[PDB]
Design a protein around this ligand. Structure first.
Ligand SMILES: *[C@@H]1O[C@H](CO)[C@@H](O)[C@H](O)[C@H]1NC(C)=O
Ligand SMILES: *[C@@H]1O[C@H](CO)[C@@H](O)[C@H](O)[C@H]1NC(C)=O
Ligand SMILES: *[C@@H]1O[C@H](CO)[C@@H](O)[C@H](O)[C@H]1NC(C)=O
Ligand SMILES: *[C@@H]1O[C@H](CO)[C@@H](O)[C@H](O)[C@H]1NC(C)=O
Ligand SMILES: *[C@@H]1O[C@H](CO)[C@@H](O)[C@H](O)[C@H]1NC(C)=O
Ligand SMILES: *[C@@H]1O[C@H](CO)[C@@H](O)[C@H](O)[C@H]1NC(C)=O
Ligand SMILES: *[C@@H]1O[C@H](CO)[C@@H](O)[C@H](O)[C@H]1NC(C)=O
Ligand SMILES: *[C@@H]1O[C@H](CO)[C@@H](O)[C@H](O)[C@H]1NC(C)=O
Ligand SMILES: *[C@@H]1O[C@H](CO)[C@@H](O)[C@H](O)[C@H]1NC(C)=O
Ligand SMILES: *[C@@H]1O[C@H](CO)[C@@H](O)[C@H](O)[C@H]1NC(C)=O
Ligand SMILES: *[C@@H]1O[C@H](CO)[C@@H](O)[C@H](O)[C@H]1NC(C)=O
Lengths: 361, 166, 130, 147, 49
């Protein structure tokens, strides 16, 4: 074996047998479940400007007063971000005004739903799939989120229960119970496939659905990169914070990186200068950290807006936007919670075995 | 205390450590170059160094328009260090914690919310909404007979003041 | 003769406890798979930035060192003798033999003026740096 | 006034650096706020095009419920949308079935569910109860009663 | 960062070491952008297998 270099292929070629008189229609169809993972929030880091720059030193604390509101504005910007993270979480998950529950008797046709529904065996009251998603992921503090993992899970339980027992009716108003097979029938009708197709193949479709859900669980377990987006967000904040601590230990031109050593070794007429150099350096570093956070926050907010739109259109209804709710003809989706984010299991109709029949316009 | 162990100086709280040092290691340092443990130079006890508790002080209150009573939250401070309620968000003083859940009023973090009720400020675990079991079955259907039109207001910003600074 | 140092020659840079952390540090270390000289005799060898020494003795034949510059009583020099049950580290203006050795008898130096320091307290590897 | 050029130059350089850094921060803060405003404006423009100049099928895009129409109103530095939506209010439990068996043929509703008054089966539109007599003109046949 | 600020000068290159990771973070940010540009290109055009 060796490393090779080549001109990359863009995919296999597939000429289409185009003609003016012949048509191909799938005799069979496959339901596809795909996983789309989106970040929703980030760690609510709050850094106290004064305490960071002037570590409990009166001389520095007084010198820092000559910089006016710089610390006030930085504390305000970080507070604004911390608040936005809870706004984003509520916008993504808190779209339902009632907490719906599944019945004690799970007669959903062998459409298991065990992997997406919470079970009473784990103390976290999370689903097997949620279990996998969770298990596989100086003057500053970290604030806790308003919605704890258990509270966020209660929300996904409710959204899943409504989607299963009332379809889209609970999203637009009151939850109207409907047998699951008819809900599937309506969703099939919504993509141009008459409901008799569903009813004639209902047993096949349900057994077939289980293998697809089990495969989702196995795919997530097997591939460690499946949740790379959420780990990447976590990694970016960890790197941002580790950057600040290392910068604090820098000299920035000062005779020494330690403020107490500056005060001990140099008389005020010289210490003032060395402190001013450390203050300018640390303030510039803190400015850079806040600027990096504000940008990262904007990307997270854009992502949260996409996730909120995605749940509203993919979970509380049926989408007609191609490739918005996964590849294929969207049927439904199921939200799952994840650390700092949301995972959508998209259930789509995909043509499988087309045939050439005879036709005319 | 303001401590100095040989050449290691700083301010902090020292507690018994459960770490095991090698016979020649004098102090411990974490992944961020912060000292987090020292060996006592006299008795060979290992001590962990915890930075002195600090945190923001926030005042949670209904407006002075209703009552001038306030509750104060000490973020990430334990109540033995400061109606005293220890919660996951910190030490909350002045609020009476209650069991009844309600819609969240003013956020305090960690699911706990405060509200002004008949009067005092209370703290509680927030409710996420009323429960509504759906009467699911395989054979029954419900259809609105008297529909209602709804007008809602959605407000979006479009522009901002065109400030130009020379 | 020369041999391959492989992955030997690493030492603890400082007296600091670190747990499950990857630490990046720059210091004087023996390069991995570096070229180290294999001696069988005892000529005078240069000492550059520091010296890595290793031996695989079952009879404990090599049991001491001389460090210095002139090694002829002109300058202070460090003599180590891990003898019996007492290892002696001594710094003096030793007038060393032109072929110093220990017996089975001590003929390392002929004179020891201006003494400044004395302290008493298979595969063996040592690192010596000043 | 107080310092000669050899000293004033230094004090001025300190003031220039401080004020320039402050202005840099102000511009950076504005550029960020502007980007958020632009994202909001893009949403508002999309919202008017899809909610005002047409009828939306995107759930909760143009307010809660089934969108009917919307009306824009101007506001200082922004736009206000009054969203007019259809919302179900008083649902009832009627009697129903997924399909009807007649001569061994399986009759599926062209639209709606097999609603009834607890005794005689009818058919009606999914979003509004209005029971109709089940006839061959509002159903279709596919398959049979054993499937 | 280093090559831009300290154009092949030992004294500057050594003085620049007192600023810690500033150059590292700037190089990282620009790398992140460069990668994002290819991600964007693939997302826009590479939607067909
Ligand atoms: C359709 O696919 C399923 C699953 O592979 C299979 O069990 C069934 O027999 C197929 N039916 C047809 C019409 O080929
Ligand atoms: C649900 O999944 C479990 C997992 O073992 C399986 O035992 C059971 O038969 C499935 N039943 C349903 C209704 O999905
Ligand atoms: C579809 O038609 C083309 C040519 O008209 C033919 O080559 C191809 O095999 C056909 N496919 C099937 C399944 O008959
Ligand atoms: C706000 O103040 C007005 C008059 O000052 C009062 O009538 C109103 O009740 C107040 N609101 C609250 C929440 O106290
Ligand atoms: C408060 O102090 C007690 C005594 O050490 C301790 O057991 C408890 O866990 C502390 N609370 C917190 C939140 O640290
Ligand atoms: C809630 O009720 C439990 C028992 O039902 C009681 O132990 C607990 O103290 C109550 N909480 C409050 C805040 O009263
Ligand atoms: C529908 O609601 C309107 C307005 O409240 C009321 O006047 C009317 O009686 C209601 N009709 C029915 C059938 O409930
Ligand atoms: C080994 O020889 C040295 C020679 O100076 C002597 O000082 C030391 O005591 C000897 N070792 C013992 C165990 O006596
Ligand atoms: C003896 O040793 C000391 C080292 O402290 C040195 O300064 C002194 O010069 C030495 N004697 C002579 C004659 O050099
Ligand atoms: C709908 O059906 C459930 C049980 O099937 C029943 O409890 C409920 O009261 C029904 N609603 C109406 C309005 O009849
Ligand atoms: C159901 O509705 C029909 C038509 O209104 C009516 O003739 C019948 O009496 C009602 N109830 C029964 C017994 O089906």
């Amino acid at each position: 074996q060796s490393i090779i270099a080549y001109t990359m292929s863009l995919g296999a070629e597939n000429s289409v047998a185009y003609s003016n008189n012949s048509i191909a229609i799938p005799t069979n169809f496959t339901i596809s479940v795909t996983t789309e993972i989106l970040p929703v929030s980030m760690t609510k880091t709050s850094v106290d400007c004064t305490m960071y720059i002037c570590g409990d030193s009166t001389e520095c604390s007084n010198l820092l007063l000559q910089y006016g509101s710089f610390c006030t504005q930085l504390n305000r910007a970080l507070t604004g971000i911390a608040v936005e993270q809870d706004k984003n979480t509520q916008e993504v998950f808190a779209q339902v005004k009632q907490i719906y529950k599944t019945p004690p008797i799970k007669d959903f046709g062998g459409f298991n739903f065990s992997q997406i529904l919470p079970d009473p065996s784990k103390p976290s009251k999370r689903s097997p799939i949620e279990d996998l998603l969770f298990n596989k992921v100086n003057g500053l503090t970290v604030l806790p989120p308003l919605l704890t993992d258990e509270m966020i899970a209660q929300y996904t339980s409710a959204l899943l229960a409504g989607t299963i027992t009332s379809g889209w009716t609970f999203g637009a108003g009151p939850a109207l119970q409907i047998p699951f097979p008819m809900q599937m029938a309506y969703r099939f009708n919504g993509i141009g496939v008459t409901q008799n197709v569903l009813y004639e193949n209902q047993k096949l479709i349900a057994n077939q659905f289980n293998s697809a859900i089990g495969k989702i669980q196995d795919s997530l377990s097997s591939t460690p990169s499946a949740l790379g987006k959420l780990q990447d967000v976590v990694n970016q904040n960890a790197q941002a914070l580790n950057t600040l601590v290392k910068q604090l230990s820098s000299n920035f031109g000062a005779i020494s990186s330690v403020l107490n050593d500056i005060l001990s070794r140099l008389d005020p007429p010289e210490a003032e200068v060395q402190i001013d150099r450390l203050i300018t350096g640390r303030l510039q570093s803190l400015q850079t950290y806040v600027t990096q956070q504000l940008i990262r926050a904007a990307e997270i907010r854009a992502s949260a807006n996409l996730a909120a739109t995605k749940m509203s259109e993919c979970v509380l209804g049926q989408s007609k936007r191609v490739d918005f709710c996964g590849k294929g003809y969207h049927l439904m989706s199921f939200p799952q919670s994840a650390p700092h984010g949301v995972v959508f299991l998209h259930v789509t109709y995909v043509p499988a075995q087309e045939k050439n029949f005879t036709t005319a316009p | 205390v303001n401590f100095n162990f040989n050449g290691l100086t700083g301010t902090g709280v020292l507690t018994e450590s459960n770490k095991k040092f090698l016979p020649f290691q004098q102090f411990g340092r974490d992944i961020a170059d912060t000292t987090d443990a020292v060996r006592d130079p006299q008795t060979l006890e290992i001590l962990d160094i915890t930075p002195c508790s600090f945190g923001g002080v926030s005042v949670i209150t209904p407006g002075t328009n209703t009552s001038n009573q306030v509750a104060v939250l000490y973020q990430d401070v334990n109540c033995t260090e400061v109606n005293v309620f220890q919660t996951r968000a910190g030490c909350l003083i002045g609020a009476e914690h209650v069991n009844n859940s309600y819609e969240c009023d003013i956020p305090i973090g960690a699911g706990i919310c405060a509200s002004y009720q008949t009067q005092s400020i209370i703290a509680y675990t927030m409710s996420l909404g009323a429960e509504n079991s759906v009467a699911y079955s395989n054979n029954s259907i419900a259809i609105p007979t008297n529909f209602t039109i709804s007008v809602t207001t959605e407000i979006l910003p479009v522009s901002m003041t065109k400030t130009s600074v020379d | 003769a020369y041999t391959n140092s492989f992955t030997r020659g690493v030492y603890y840079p400082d007296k600091v406890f670190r747990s499950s952390v990857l630490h990046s540090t720059q210091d004087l270390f023996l390069p991995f798979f570096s070229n180290v000289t294999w001696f069988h005799d005892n000529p005078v060898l240069p000492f550059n930035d520091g010296v890595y020494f290793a031996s695989t003795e079952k009879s404990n034949i090599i049991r001491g060192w001389i460090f210095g510059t002139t090694l002829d009583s002109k300058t202070q020099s460090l003599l180590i003798v891990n003898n019996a049950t007492n290892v002696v580290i001594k710094v003096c203006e030793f007038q060393f033999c032109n072929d110093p050795f220990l017996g089975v008898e001590f003929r390392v130096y002929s004179s020891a003026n201006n003494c400044t320091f004395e302290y008493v307290s298979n595969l063996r590897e040592f690192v010596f740096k000043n | 006034s107080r310092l000669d050029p050899p000293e004033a130059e230094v004090q001025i350089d300190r003031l220039i650096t401080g004020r320039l850094q402050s202005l840099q921060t102000y511009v950076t803060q504005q550029l960020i706020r502007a980007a958020e405003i632009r994202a909001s404006a893009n949403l508002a423009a999309t919202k008017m095009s899809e909610c005002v100049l047409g009828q939306s099928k995107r759930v909760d895009f143009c307010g809660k419920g089934y969108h009917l129409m919307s009306f824009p109103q101007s506001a200082p530095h922004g736009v206000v949308f009054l969203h007019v939506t259809y919302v179900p209010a008083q649902e009832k439990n009627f009697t129903t079935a997924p399909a009807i068996c007649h001569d061994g043929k399986a009759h599926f509703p062209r639209e709606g569910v097999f609603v009834s008054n607890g005794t005689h089966w009818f058919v009606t539109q999914r979003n509004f109860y209005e029971p109709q007599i089940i006839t061959t003109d509002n159903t279709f046949v596919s398959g049979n009663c054993d499937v």
